[PDB]
Amino acid sequence: LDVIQEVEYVKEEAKMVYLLECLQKTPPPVLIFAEKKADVDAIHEYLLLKGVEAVAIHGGKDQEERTKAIEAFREGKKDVLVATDVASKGLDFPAIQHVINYDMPEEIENYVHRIGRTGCTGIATTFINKACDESVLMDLKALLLEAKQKVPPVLQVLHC
């Protein structure tokens, strides 16, 4: 409820580059969420290739890896944790300065929970595009407005 939500239209083929730029709105720590394992893996490899202290958690990591990352992050030894929703559930995270939603969830319920991982202020960035159904976009729109947040142009048309 008390986070600055920054929702932005980003073509699928442009997110990786934009993500790098995003990391800079904020000092660490940063949590990047994506629905799929493949994605979490891509983003982590990209961040590494660009030189970001980045760790990743998902259902396909073994116990060694999960533990090592959940805790380097939790100590501040790593700036960025990239996670799936399901892998991050119940983890004890520190004060997160910035949530980056690389995906828009299908349910608005889930958008909230993700952005609910920063606050108590902080920034939530959410990449939206063509693939989102109208319904979630309306609920995102409805939410930004109730939250008294910037509505990006692409949503400002939804209902004029």
Author numbering: 406 to 525, 529 to 568
Which sentences did the original study use to describe this structure?
DExD/H-box RNA helicases, from virus and bacteria to eukaryotes, play important roles in processes including ribosome biogenesis, RNA processing and folding, ribonucleoprotein (RNP) remodeling, RNA nuclear export, the regulation of RNA translation and transcription, and nonsense-mediated RNA decay. DExD/H-box proteins often contain accessory regulatory domains and localization modules, but their cores consist of two RecA-like domains joined by a short flexible linker. Both domains contribute to the binding site for RNA substrates and both contribute to ATP hydrolysis. We used X-ray crystallography to determine the structures of the DEAD-domains of DDX2A, DDX2B, DDX5, DDX10, DDX18, DDX20, DDX47, DDX52, and DDX53, as well as the helicase domains of DDX25 and DDX41.
DDX41 (Abstrakt) post-transcriptionally regulates the expression levels of the insc protein that is essential for control of cell polarity and spindle orientation. The helicase domain contributes to nucleotide coordination via motifs V and VI. A superposition of DDX19 with the DDX25 and DDX41 helicase domains shows that in the latter two structures part of motif VI is not visible in the electron density, indicating its flexibility. The conserved motifs IV and VI superpose well, whereas motif V shows different conformations in all three structures. In the free helicase domain structures motif V, an important RNA backbone interaction site is in a binding incompetent conformation.
